[PDB]
Write a protein that binds this ligand. Structure first.
Ligand SMILES: COc1cccc(-c2cccc(NC(=O)CCc3cccc4c3[B-](O)(O)OC4)c2)c1
Ligand SMILES: [Cl-]
Ligand SMILES: [Cl-]
Ligand SMILES: [Fe+3]
Ligand SMILES: [Fe+3]
Length: 426
């Protein structure tokens, strides 16, 4: 393979890409890149559906003292949740980078995550902070002969798509990205610099997102239906990111419906005209009807789980899941509509509240991913960050898009965890 940036050719160099997490799955993103003696780790998250050391990527398969560079795409815990453990409980001595906004949220986010088999303590989190260097967007940095810079990814504030260049070979890692313009977030940039390799998320496979006006209308109608019948509405959200979006939509809908002005909306985490802030359960009068937006987004524990257990037995109540549901979480389990749930204390409760799923996770759909790949046409595309069935359908659909393309033949890979993808560059 001739690098796209580049006579009797000499020796070929082999590039190695191996996912330790997010390989044919969603969670614990951690992809290893090896080329010409350099070793790079892309993200270092935890699996939200597993517990303890099982929620970590397969770090045992590598020698962490040989990792030259660690790049963190955004502040979500499936991409940086394992970072304090990797920085403090392991022989890693390389350099770590994330954007300025990402580091700022990371310190408070993981501090919250620790408070609510503990991989690390809040002590470990604070000592590893100075090991994390920052980087501006559209600015080249070099570490051990590795040139890298980042583009805007959309998705959440500070989310970055890292471009990596070693010996003229360019690789683009999208992390999590979205191409649909938000109310408070830009769409992901499409680089004009063309990469040899693309590592791209596959969260929604070949699904196509419902138009934003349709999902917003159904979201507001479902909330309205819940409080109108005297119910309490639970909107589990991950602390920062999509929560501000949903609060804008509800604040606008409340203003245009005066019959809802007396119904409170609470946002509980650690300028609207109809939304109040909430500190904890102690500061909250559970008076129905009401709307409560609480963390975490998948009711694994914490406030959203406590409110769900308090409200799930009343059919007037309802929960609205707005994010992507990972296997092993309570939010994914209730999609099957079980007769009963199990509380954190081990008690069985009948699930009688309504359960609705209106997606607002801010990932690309097939159209956005296909357009993104067509604009770049990288000879090799590697799918990560997606369930096995969704990723297999995305691979087949993208392959079919380029069988009749005489200009470029694009190879698509969907490696399992620990599975290596090998590419040779002249
Ligand atoms: C009490 O706090 C807790 C307790 C236990 C587990 C978690 C936890 C762990 C991992 C991820 C998460 N959620 C997130 O990062 C939110 C974003 C998210 C959520 C689900 C799936 C995906 C993403 B994505 O946009 O990064 O793409 C895939 C929470 C938190
Ligand atoms: Cl070199
Ligand atoms: Cl191998
Ligand atoms: Fe994310
Ligand atoms: Fe993710």
């Amino acid at each position: 393979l001739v690098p796209r940036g580049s006579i009797p050719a000499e020796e070929s160099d082999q590039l190695l890409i191996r996912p330790l997490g997010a390989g044919q799955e969603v969670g614990r993103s951690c992809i290893i890149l090896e080329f010409k003696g350099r070793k790079i780790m892309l993200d270092c998250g935890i699996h939200p559906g597993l517990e303890g050391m099982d929620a970590l990527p397969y770090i045992d398969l590598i020698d962490p003292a040989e990792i030259d560079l660690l790049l963190i795409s955004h502040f979500h815990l499936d991409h940086c949740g394992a970072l304090p453990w990797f920085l403090q409980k392991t022989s890693f001595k390389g350099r770590t980078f994330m954007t300025h906004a990402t580091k700022a949220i990371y310190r408070w986010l993981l501090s919250d995550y620790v408070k609510v088999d503990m991989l690390y303590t809040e002590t470990d989190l604070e000592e590893s902070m100075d090991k994390i260097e920052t980087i501006n967007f559209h600015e080249v940095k070099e570490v051990a002969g590795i040139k890298f810079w980042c583009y805007h990814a959309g998705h959440v504030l500070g989310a970055a798509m890292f471009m990596i260049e070693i010996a003229g070979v360019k690789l683009l890692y999208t992390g999590d990205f979205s191409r649909q313009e938000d109310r408070h977030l830009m769409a992901a940039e499409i680089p004009n610099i063309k990469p040899d390799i693309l590592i791209i998320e596959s969260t929604y496979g070949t699904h196509i997102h419902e138009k934003r006006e349709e999902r917003e209308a159904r979201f507001c109608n479902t909330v309205h239906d819940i409080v109108n019948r005297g119910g309490r509405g639970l909107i589990p959200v991950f602390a920062l990111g999509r929560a501000q979006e949903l609060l804008l939509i509800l604040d606008e809908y409340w203003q245009n419906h005066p019959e809802l002005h007396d119904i409170p909306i609470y946002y509980a985490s650690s300028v609207f005209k109809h939304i109040s802030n909430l500190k904890s359960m102690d500061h909250f009068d559970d008076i129905g009807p009401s709307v409560v937006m609480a963390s975490p987004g998948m009711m694994q524990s914490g406030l959203s789980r406590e409110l769900f257990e308090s409200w799930c037995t009343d059919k007037r109540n309802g929960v609205i899941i707005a994010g992507y549901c990972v296997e092993g979480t309570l939010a994914k389990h209730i999609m099957s509509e079980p007769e009963e749930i199990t509380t954190m204390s081990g008690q069985k409760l009948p699930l009688k509240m309504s359960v609705d799923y209106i997606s607002f996770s801010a990932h690309t759909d097939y159209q956005q991913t296909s357009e993104f790949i067509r604009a770049l046409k990288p000879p090799h595309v590697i799918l990560v960050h997606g369930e096995q069935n969704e990723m297999a359908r995305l691979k087949a659909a993208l392959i079919r898009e380029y069988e009749d393309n005489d200009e470029v033949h694009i190879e698509v890979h969907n490696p399992r965890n620990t599975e290596a993808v090998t590419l040779n560059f002249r």
